[PDB]
């Protein structure tokens, strides 16, 4: 289900084969030309499409472009060398910009930025003021 592309010297390297790799998938209603983050132009297929990239940002950048084409069914995965796959985005099925009941707060401090502790107070502690 690979989109039609002729190849580039800006594709993935060894890290994709020995450390980690990424993959995005989407469905289209027409064959159209899009610009790939790696560099160049490609033609998507009329239906399912799969593409591999080396960075999550590269994948999410393409998603932005896809939204312009009115495609909002994209999914991003991380494939480890052993074959293990992790579903990353949309994580809970709902885009992050939309509040979804069932998501808990993380890394939240209940005070204004100016209420953090003084650096000297936490000296020889190992923690930082913003983590204190």
């Amino acid at each position: 289900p690979f989109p039609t592309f002729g190849g580039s010297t800006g594709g993935w390297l060894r890290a994709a084969e020995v450390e980690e790799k990424y993959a995005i998938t989407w469905t289209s209603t027409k064959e159209q030309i899009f610009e790939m983050p790696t560099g160049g132009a490609a033609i998507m297929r009329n239906g399912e499409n799969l593409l591999y990239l080396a960075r999550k940002e590269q994948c999410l950048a393409l998603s932005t472009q896809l939204r312009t084409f009115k495609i909002n069914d994209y999914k991003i995965y991380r494939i480890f060398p052993s074959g293990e796959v992790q579903y990353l985005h949309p994580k809970d099925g709902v885009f992050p910009e939309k509040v979804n009941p069932g998501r808990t707060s993380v890394n939240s401090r209940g005070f204004s930025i100016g209420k953090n502790p003084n650096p000297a107070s936490i000296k020889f502690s190992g923690i930082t003021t913003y983590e204190s």
Binding site: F5, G6, G7, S8, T9, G11, W12
Partner: protein
């Protein structure tokens, strides 16, 4: 006709199959080079590589060195080459230690500690000997005249 295609038919790998990258000439040359040739033992691989690199290195030193115009210029050139070979050998030793570690098992895989050590040894012998051969050859140059 398109003479440039995606490498290995993977449109997303960062490489292309150009005439330079994948031509019968390039494939043939690289396949038979000592580094990638099939069947050569680690020692022999190093030996061939060393023999090749030592012979051409004596030239630069002998003809352009500080004592080039001296009667002992060629001798000095030889010594200089040996010095350079030693430096390069140190590098090979150090690389192996860092890249491969301290104890190995696979064996006969240029990419293991034991194999690398053997490879390094071959390089040293070949390089130094090759430089010596050049010394003997450059001692008397033939005019090939009848």
């Amino acid at each position: 006709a398109n003479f440039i295609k995606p490498y290995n038919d993977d449109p997303f790998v960062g490489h292309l199959a150009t005439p330079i990258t994948s031509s019968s000439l390039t494939r043939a040359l690289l396949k038979n080079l000592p580094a990638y040739r099939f069947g050569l033992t680690p020692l022999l691989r190093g030996l061939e590589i060393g023999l090749a690199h030592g012979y051409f290195l004596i030239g630069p030193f002998a003809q352009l060195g500080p004592l080039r115009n001296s009667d002992i210029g060629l001798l000095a050139g030889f010594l200089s080459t040996i010095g350079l070979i030693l430096i390069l050998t140190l590098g090979l030793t150090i690389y192996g230690a860092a890249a491969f570690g301290q104890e190995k098992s696979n064996g006969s895989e240029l990419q293991t500690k034991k194999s690398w050590d053997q490879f390094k040894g071959g390089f040293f012998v070949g390089a130094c000997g090759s430089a010596g051969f050049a010394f003997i050859c450059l001692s008397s140059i033939p005019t090939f005249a009848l």
